[PDB]
Write a protein that binds this ligand. Structure first.
Ligand SMILES: CC(=O)OCc1ccccc1
Length: 162
């Protein structure tokens, strides 16, 4: 188990434009296209991302290419974020995957909301951090995925992904 296998489980793989858990046009392995309700706007974003006229459909290879880019960008974003970097660097390799997973799903706009969770993680107060992480819109809207990610943060094992 590694970050790619973990996110592949959590995000799935679909080769046609679909709506994510929030109702947003998405493709591949959780590649968000746009928050616009206009399918044509999503199709434009897709064509730009792939570099050809896709008409809303991609190949598995193309999905995996976007996924490589998205994971890379998620990790690098963490390192470029003054709040996230020290916490990330304090973590072991398995808990780092939980961090990448959460950033991949949520982006960085809500980082400040997780200030207390982040502190508890840096302090290695794992059970306390897990309790705090669940007190969130994130947990309530995607509880089974959040439970897996939280178990990963709590234990530093892959038990939730088997
Ligand atoms: C806001 C958040 O919890 O993103 C995940 C994370 C967790 C620990 C270190 C870096 C990023």
């Amino acid at each position: 188990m590694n970050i790619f296998e973990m996110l592949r489980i959590d995000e799935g793989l679909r080769l046609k434009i679909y709506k994510d858990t929030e109702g947003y046009y998405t493709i591949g392995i959780g590649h968000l296209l746009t928050k616009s309700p206009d399918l044509n706007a999503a199709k434009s974003e897709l064509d730009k991302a792939i570099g050809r006229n896709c008409n809303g459909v991609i190949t598995k290879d193309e999905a995996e290419k976007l996924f490589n880019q998205d994971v890379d960008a998620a990790v690098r974003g963490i390192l470029r974020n003054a709040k996230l970097k020290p916490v990330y660097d304090s973590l072991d390799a398995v808990r780092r995957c939980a961090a990448i997973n959460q950033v991949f799903q949520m982006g960085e706009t809500g980082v400040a909301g997780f200030t207390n969770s982040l502190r508890m993680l840096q302090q290695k107060r794992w059970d306390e951090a897990a309790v705090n992480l669940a007190k969130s819109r994130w947990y309530n809207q995607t509880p089974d995925r959040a439970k897996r990610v939280i178990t990963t943060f709590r234990t530093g094992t892959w038990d939730a992904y088997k």
